[PDB]
Symmetry: C4
Subunit: 91 residues, 4 copies
């Protein structure tokens, strides 16, 4: 149920990002699949700032309003999900 | 409860960093909002050392005394706010 | 216990990656030992995308099909081993 | 107390490895390991896993190959203990 919620989340943000940054950043968001890849990378927190967001903000200042919240939501969910797997296996 | 304390901590360090490193590193610390961004990136641990702390230490060495503790504080509280919310449900 | 199967998982993927990407990326995959190093770094998530997967995808596109699953598998097992001590 | 004693064990482990690395890699990599304080900073960065491989270990291995035998274990140990201190709060709730 949570895994579905998250996938929905990725899907929504992937579509949004493609239409928001795909023009100026084809390598990372030009496609809905490219956006999926990039958003997953951001989720693992790998080079999200130095490698993706900071460069993005050089063209679209305040794009941080799309990514920091995305980071919060995605991190939070994953945290919970993990806890459940860990907690329930113990119980 | 942690959420507000954390916001306080971020605000303290952001104000501190702005006054401390904003002159030499305006791209990351020149503004109170720039310092907000940088300190969150450092909290996510994304290029905190190689990308931010090591460059800053070429100018103001031993600035790790601000950063490493900031890392402990924010890391520990986010560990705590996670466990706190999680154990409950 | 969890460590017993994860070791197997790493060995499978390492053998797979060596045969798949060792030709074009010998610095990271040319050896079975090299692929062991690379896959562990990818497991710790350090520069997996920008540093490893994205450059590999310029040669073999859709190689994320190996990596992203490898990432889920190895990340998942870590929590099952983290709790597998507790 | 352990938390505290485990935190004291960690401090010991960091001191061990920091002394080790200074003597092992400080010659060839003085910016990262030339000092006991430099090795302190580097080992903590490796602990938070930020550019540990691409940034530190991979470059060190071009000089002393198989120095991953120092690093990968150090990673295991410090990451495990920090998780031991994490669960030492998980059930301590």
């Amino acid at each position: 149920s949570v895994a579905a919620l998250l996938t929905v989340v990725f899907y929504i943000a992937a579509v949004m990002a493609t239409n928001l940054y795909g023009a100026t950043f084809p390598e990372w968001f030009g496609d809905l699949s490219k956006s999926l890849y990039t958003l997953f990378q951001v989720m693992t927190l790998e080079s999200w700032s130095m490698g993706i967001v900071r460069p993005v903000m050089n063209v679209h200042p305040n794009a941080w309003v799309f990514f920091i919240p995305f980071i919060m939501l995605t991190t939070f969910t994953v945290l919970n999900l993990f806890i459940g797997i860990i907690v329930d296996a113990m119980a």
